[PDB]
Amino acid sequence: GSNEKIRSQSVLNTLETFFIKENHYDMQREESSIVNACLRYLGYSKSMCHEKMPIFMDIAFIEYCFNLSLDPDSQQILWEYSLISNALERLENIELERQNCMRENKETLNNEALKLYSCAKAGICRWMAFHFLEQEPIDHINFTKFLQDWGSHNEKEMEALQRLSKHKIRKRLIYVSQHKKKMPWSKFNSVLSRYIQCTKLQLEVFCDYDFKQREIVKMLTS
């Protein structure tokens, strides 16, 4: 029964030694085969099916998903609905996990992570909206389904998205192309990256996770 468990835990341990870096994770070519083999194993591991996703995994995914170790053509990220919904869910887990662990400068680190989270979340959603509008034909089925799950409910934006949804290609592209300049991806990459590292720091300082923030800590005592 638990020979599979002892195995899976060791695979999870191994990934942890590849996914926890001081700065953000990026999958390097020399790691990719073993990183793949580990994920696949855990993916089909019977004993992992109802195990809680550790927060290092969710972080590493977010770093990898939003290419956080760069500083962004906007187009290294796959803006597919199915993926980005799950990306937001995993991001949501990190924030809840952060909030929960925090109860057990701390005001600043908590408050910044809050502000940064909402800012990043909003940006992800706005850029998801941007991609949805560039479709021909538009996937209203998933687009409106997305707006229930992620993105708030203001008659203003609700109807404005609907109004623009019934316009055409070149005008739809123009609203997006203007608003992508008015709201650049570089802004959110910064935010999301700072959130992740702000989060990392709290959890090592206070909750005693190990996110390799030991060197960052000692430079704040000086």
């Binding site: 400068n105 600043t108 680190l109 910044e112 992570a113 502000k115 940064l116 909402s118 800012c119 909003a122 940006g123 706005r126 203003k156 934006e157 404005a160 709201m183 935010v191 700072r194 959130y195 590292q197 702000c198």
Partner: peptide, 17 residues
């Protein structure tokens, strides 16, 4: 114990629409 660490003192984190 600063009031800024990861966020710059005057920074617009307000996303409209």
């Amino acid at each position: 114990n600063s009031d800024n660490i990861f966020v710059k003192p005057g920074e617009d984190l307000e996303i409209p629409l």
